[PDB]
Design an enzyme around this catalytic site. Structure first.
Site, short mmCIF file in Angstrom:
data_model
loop_
_atom_site.label_atom_id
_atom_site.label_comp_id
_atom_site.label_asym_id
_atom_site.label_seq_id
_atom_site.Cartn_x
_atom_site.Cartn_y
_atom_site.Cartn_z
CB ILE C 321 -1.07 0.02 1.14
CG1 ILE C 321 -2.19 -0.97 0.82
CG2 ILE C 321 -1.66 1.42 1.32
CD1 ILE C 321 -3.16 -1.26 1.96
CG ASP C 325 1.15 5.00 -8.14
OD1 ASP C 325 1.94 5.61 -7.37
OD2 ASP C 325 1.51 4.45 -9.21
CB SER C 350 -7.20 5.84 -8.49
OG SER C 350 -6.23 6.13 -9.49
NE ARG C 351 -1.86 6.34 -2.40
CZ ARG C 351 -0.93 6.12 -1.48
NH1 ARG C 351 0.32 6.46 -1.72
NH2 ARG C 351 -1.25 5.57 -0.32
CB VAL C 352 -1.37 9.08 -10.40
CG1 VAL C 352 -0.39 9.79 -9.48
CG2 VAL C 352 -1.14 7.57 -10.38
#
Ligand SMILES: Nc1ncnc2c1ncn2[C@@H]1O[C@H](COP(=O)(O)OP(=O)(O)NP(=O)(O)O)[C@@H](O)[C@H]1O
Ligand SMILES: Nc1ncnc2c1ncn2[C@@H]1O[C@H](COP(=O)(O)OP(=O)(O)NP(=O)(O)O)[C@@H](O)[C@H]1O
Ligand SMILES: [Mg+2]
Ligand SMILES: [Mg+2]
Lengths: 468, 482, 483
Positions: C321, C325, C350-352
């Site tokens: 984790i 991303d 989702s980070r990007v």
């Protein structure tokens, strides 16, 4: 005739010296001749300077530095084929029933490679089990592994014994029962009941082969016995083309034994004490139970859960290999339902519209959903009485109660204990039979006609005897 | 010399590492110059590792060591009845030499798959709670498990005391000889135990194998196997013997001490990875033999101490998985006054009803049921309740009280069934809970004065015919009203 | 026999082989033993080499000849590996013969640094109403699938691959997503039955299976994800787009612990070695979107972790984790009930992939993300009041919960999704029974395809929703709902 010399003895761990380049490969059996009989040792390590570390298969008390050790040329080998049926065999393929030698036509190494990815069957398929509850709601995968849950008090040895029976009649496959760490008293129990029940028939034809590796045998023997039984079960697949049953009881005790050997060999324990090889050890056994182009080994494995902690690496690693489960229960037993399968607890990866067909899947799904809605009513049925039931619900409750009794079945093997004849019910029956009940075609047949009967015609016939 | 002799390389912590002994057997007894004995547990390349049976101030570097030629063994036979021996069978009771029928190895293979017959004969403990709910059969391994100071030994001791009934007869098939293994207890405890058996005239059929608190670990490690051979003479000669290992926790501890000192790989809780094999080697030796092999039997009551009721601990787990059931005892039940502090919902006999006098199976088949129902509805003991759930409460409370018992007073089967017929079948629900004590006392004596007839038939037939329940019902109803 | 090029085995046990000589061996060089089994030179000492076996120890004896390879552990790569199933050392196991390879990348390759990357912006289209609306995955991203045993983890990865068929038949070279599915510690049958599922759906032709199964020696399982990365990297390096699925890294970490303990490394947290974070980190860092100065090629990783009883604070879950991303967390409690994919929205991110969402999804899924994580608010505190105000939320939520339910092997186009989420978000389902929401989809999508194929073609072409096309989506939904 390759000889060596015992150079070290510490409990079940024996080190042995050999001449340069005459060293037995890892996993080869070695033999010391005792006055008892023979002591078998399994090579585990090359330590250097022509010495090998090995694990004993029986006690090492009375051994003496310098005693001669014969190299067998290969792994432990075991008799295979029809001649094993009806016999009791220990880890090293010796008869232990005092019935003379197994004059089997071959002997085969217990360590063997699993079928290749190329050899692998491509579509999972059902094993028709003749048993109702199981074939409708949690069908066995052919080549699959199935965890059998619940111990004493639930009719286990009979369930297992009817599987042996039904499979040998509906598929002409034999069975191998392997007791791993079983209680000896209970191994004896099972042998006596297999003769009583007919599945072992010392004069006539026998359906099953017995392989026992008791608690009092050293860790090495208990670690390995599962393989022995499997090797017998493999030959029926590979040379006979049979769909074969393999009972491993108990699979937890195979993990424990493996754990014990690892500790004794000096390996650093992994998480929770278990061996660091827990998964590969499990893999090495499980991966051999499968479908080949020849046929299939299908294993039923009693699984014990420590402290009921499904996360303890033991069950966690075991579960990764299970395709279905059959859960026998005191709760189903006390109600009067034989076998005592929990039809909402037993689950199968193959209960899937793709594998079993939409007809099969639709029936089974509603049967569950019915019994599930019926469970959360058991509370308010006791308080609000019965009259306070709604239009759909009043009917489905009276219907579930019939379905709940249609899941019971008399076993051919239990006939001697019961008097009732035994019925082997077909899948095409079971699905169709239950598809008719669900729709409302038999809402006007009293409960007792669904109880302890075979295929749909047996409800019709009994209902017309409950009128005479 | 060197084949039959060795020199001491190093010594300390009860281990002597020895040079030579080139012809010694794994687990051969050896003998040191000063007179202390010990056993070869580690045959290694250059050297042998020997565990001492005595204080290692007795051994020195360079000292001579002698093979003896024999794996550890022990004297066996009836010459041991009434005797208290050390782990090697040396008598300690002050009563002179032990006449042996022959000698037998500590380690011996358990009867295999074949020479066993299903357990079918009662081991009568004489304890209502047990005999009614957790029946032990000849051949069975029934664990006694619980925390410190809960009644574990008492349960074995009152069982031992009960064998008086048949051990005072001539029919040897009914007799149960007794082996009590004192492992890691202090000496005065074992002395106070023997004084008790002597007082209850139960020494005469008993053997005490005592490897106590201040003895070398190997002796504590050995005591159980040694006694198991002593007990096996009986089994192996068409007779029946009960063995109590009190307790296997302490044995596990000495085994562990040996193993770590000999530097063998430790694992969970620092037990060697063959500790399970230690106990299953031992407990699988209890068995009921087949007709072909004498029909003799050994029966084992191992004891296990738990810590804070933690059955998940390593040794408790091993043993609980090896045996055929637990009698599980609890501090809380004890203080409540429920003695034996048996927790029924946690106790089992995996053999069960086949190990039970038919008479008791008959009246107490239901008893199994009710206490189970009692326990579910239990927390309701605190008002506005059903006629259903209060009846459950009334009956349970009484059966729970019936099942209380004093120490050193095990009851005959013909005294149990009428007490349990009375309870189970409602004839107690009128009597106040304070009097179920004085009631049992008064009912039995009365039954003795007036209905000695049915007591006898229960004792003699062991069954209850239809006339008998009807007679029992008559004798009970007549006593209650008075 | 050279002592520089050749060796003799001193000892073999516990997966290690000790060899004398091999004086010109490299650190991490493959070797071949007498029997054909290969190994890696792990630890290099005065007077001996420590070699980790890629197979059973039975296969190596004391006194045996061992030949150098010259080569550091590596695999064949290239486009010739599509529709193939190799093992961890790139050895072909599908029986389809020699691997046709463009060459040999190493197993351990360094990840492109700070410079050679660009941010993610292109959609990896999963066809899963829940993923693409609520946790959009970019091309170059690393999104972890995480959940308990048997929670449709593989199913997400698989349906993502079967959804690629859409563009992997096309002429446009850039919207093509070549796949790599890595099987670590799985059953041999599962992987064979899985291939057969890629075969039937005609997906096998653009994918590569690398398998180190349950029974195979640990270092092979340890090795499998890396040699899969190199195979994948080829596409990334040559201006194409590969998707890699590690199934799973749990089992790899377990394999690696075995290797580590047999090698006697200090066991730490849950007896994993000190360097288990690093094992994964160096792996998952090889997923990137490359800058146009490097050919714009993109590797995308979807690793799978298996939690135990829903606990994400375990060592291995928190490590990955803190590499990836984002996480698609799948929940045993949801899966039990029927909500499948069991994407626990609250606990998924989702980070990007934000930039990578198709605008038309982003438009009808406007704050659907943060509403659903908040329908979860009332639904956990309503089981307390019959409030008219908060009952429309509980009926938007409940309908939307059934709207995101999906059959397996049924991935959907973008165009098929946007109108389903329009009919949800804007409340067009509120009067329709719950048990008919699944029948609404299938009837509605047919009604859409039969009449309004002009609107459906247009969403696909633009990737946007014009105010015209939204004013029309309104008419077609109201018209069908009334009948
Ligand atoms: N049935 C009984 N009724 C009344 N008291 C009893 C009974 N059984 C045992 N006791 C007493 O309770 C105490 C503990 O019993 P005991 O048999 O010593 O248990 P234990 O488990 O051996 N304790 P220890 O061995 O010291 O860990 C002693 O004082 C006994 O006399
Ligand atoms: N969208 C879906 N709808 C219905 N069933 C599904 C769906 N996705 C997966 N399943 C089924 O749920 C079961 C388990 O899913 P699976 O994808 O194997 O999860 P998993 O996490 O890989 N389990 P495992 O790999 O054994 O730990 C299988 O029977 C799947 O076919
Ligand atoms: Mg005590
Ligand atoms: Mg999976």
């Amino acid at each position: 005739p390759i000889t060596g010399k015992v150079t070290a003895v510490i409990g079940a761990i024996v080190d042995v010296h050999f001449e340069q380049s005459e060293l037995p490969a890892i996993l080869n059996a070695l033999e010391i001749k005792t006055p008892q009989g023979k002591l078998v040792l399994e090579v585990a390590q090359h330590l250097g300077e022509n010495t090998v570390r090995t694990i004993a298969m029986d006690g090492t008390e009375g051994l003496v530095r310098g005693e001669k050790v014969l190299d067998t040329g290969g792994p432990i080998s075991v008799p295979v084929g029809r001649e094993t049926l009806g016999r009791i065999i220990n880890v090293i393929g010796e008869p232990i029933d005092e019935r003379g030698p197994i004059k089997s036509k071959l002997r085969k190494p217990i360590h063997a490679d699993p079928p290749s990815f190329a050899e692998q069957s491509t579509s999972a398929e059902i094993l028709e089990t003749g048993i109702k509850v199981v074939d409708l709601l949690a069908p066995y995968a052919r080549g699959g592994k199935i965890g059998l849950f619940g111990g004493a008090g639930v009719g286990k040895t009979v369930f297992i014994q009817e599987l042996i029976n039904n499979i040998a009649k509906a598929h002409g496959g034999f069975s191998v029962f392997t007791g791993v760490g079983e209680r000896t008293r209970e191994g004896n129990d099972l042998y006596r009941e297999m003769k009583e029940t007919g599945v072992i028939n010392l004069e006539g034809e026998s359906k099953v082969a017995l392989v026992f590796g008791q608690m009092n045998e050293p860790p090495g023997a208990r670690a390995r016995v599962a393989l022995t039984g499997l090797t017998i079960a493999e030959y029926f697949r590979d040379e006979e083309g049979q769909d074969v049953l393999l009972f491993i009881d108990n699979i937890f005790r195979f993990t424990q034994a493996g754990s014990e050997v690892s500790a004794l060999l000096g390996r650093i324990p992994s998480a929770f004490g278990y061996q660091p090889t827990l998964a590969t050890d499990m893999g090495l056994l499980q991966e051999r139970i499968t479908t080949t182009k020849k046929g299939s080994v299908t294993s039923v494995q009693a699984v014990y859960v420590p402290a009921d902690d499904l996360t303890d690496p033991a069950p966690a690693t075991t579960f990764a290999h299970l395709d279905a489960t059959t859960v026998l229960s005191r709760g189903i037993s006390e109600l009067g339902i034989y076998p005592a399968v929990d039809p909402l607890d037993s689950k199968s990866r193959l209960l899937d519209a793709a594998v079993v067909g939409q007809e099969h899947y639709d029936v089974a799904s509603k049967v569950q959903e019915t019994l599930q809605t019926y469970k959360s009513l058991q509370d308010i049925i006791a308080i609000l009485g019965m009259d306070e039931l709604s239009e759909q619900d009043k009917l489905t409750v009276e219907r579930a109660r019939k379905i709940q009794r249609f899941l019971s079945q008399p076993f051919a093997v239990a006939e001697v204990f019961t008097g009732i004849p035994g019925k082997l019910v077909r899948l095409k029956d079971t699905v169709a039979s239950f598809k008719a009940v669900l729709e409302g075609k038999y809402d006007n047949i009293p409960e007792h006609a669904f109880y302890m009967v075979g295929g749909i015609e047996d409800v019709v016939a009994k209902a017309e005897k409950l009128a005479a | 010399n060197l084949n039959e002799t060795g020199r001491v390389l190093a010594v300390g912590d009860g281990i002597a590492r020895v040079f030579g002994l080139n012809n010694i057997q794994a687990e051969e007894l050896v003998e040191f110059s000063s007179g202390v004995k010990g056993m070869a547990l580690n045959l290694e390349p250059g050297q042998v590792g020997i565990v001492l049976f005595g204080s290692d101030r007795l051994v020195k570097e360079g000292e001579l060591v002698k093979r003896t030629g024999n794996i550890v063994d022990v004297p066996v036979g009836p010459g041991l009845l009434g005797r208290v021996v050390d782990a090697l069978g040396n008598p300690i009771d002050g009563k002179g030499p032990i006449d042996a029928a022959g000698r037998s190895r500590a380690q011996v293979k358990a009867p295999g798959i074949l020479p066993r017959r299903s357990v079918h004969e009662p081991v009568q403990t004489g304890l209502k709670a047990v005999d009614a709910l957790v029946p032990i059969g000849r051949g069975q391994r029934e664990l006694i498990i619980g925390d410190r100071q809960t009644g574990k030994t008492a349960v074995a001791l009152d069982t031992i005391l009960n064998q008086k009934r048949w051990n005072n007869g001539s029919d040897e098939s009914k007799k149960l000889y007794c082996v009590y293994v004192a492992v890691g207890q202090k000496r005065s405890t074992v002395a106070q135990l023997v004084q008790t058996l002597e007082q209850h005239d139960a020494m005469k059929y008993s053997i005490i194998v005592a490897a106590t608190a201040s003895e070398a670990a190997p002796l504590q490690y050995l005591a159980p196997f040694t006694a198991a051979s002593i007990g096996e003479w009986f089994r192996d000669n068409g007779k029946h013997a009960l063995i109590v290992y009190d307790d296997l926790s302490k044995q596990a501890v000495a085994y562990r001490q040996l193993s770590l000192l000999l530097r063998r790989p430790p694992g969970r809780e620092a037990y060697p990875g063959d500790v399970f094999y230690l106990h299953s080697r031992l407990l699988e030796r209890a068995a009921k033999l087949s007709e072909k092999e004498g029909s003799g039997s050994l029966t084992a009551l191992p004891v296990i101490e738990t810590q804070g009721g933690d059955v998940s601990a390593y040794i408790p787990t091993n043993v609980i998985s090896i045996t055929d059931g637990q009698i599980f005892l609890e501090a809380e039940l004890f203080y409540k006054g429920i003695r034996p502090a048996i927790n029924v919902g946690l106790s089992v006999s995996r053999v069960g009803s086949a190990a039970q006098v038919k008479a008791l199976k008959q009246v107490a088949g239901s008893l199994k049921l009710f206490l189970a129902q009692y326990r579910e509805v239990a927390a309701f003991a605190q008002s506005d309740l059903d006629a259903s759930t209060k009846q459950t409460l009334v009956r349970g409370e009484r059966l729970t009280q019936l099942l209380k018992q004093n120490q050193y007073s095990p009851l005959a089967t013909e005294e149990q069934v009428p007490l349990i017929y009375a309870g189970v079948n409602g004839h107690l629900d009128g009597i106040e809970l304070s009097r179920i004590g004085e009631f049992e006392s008064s009912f039995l004596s009365y039954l003795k004065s007036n209905h000695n007839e049915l007591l006898t038939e229960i004792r003699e037939k062991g069954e209850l015919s239809k006339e008998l329940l009807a007679s029992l019902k008559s004798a009970t109803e007549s006593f209650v009203a008075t």
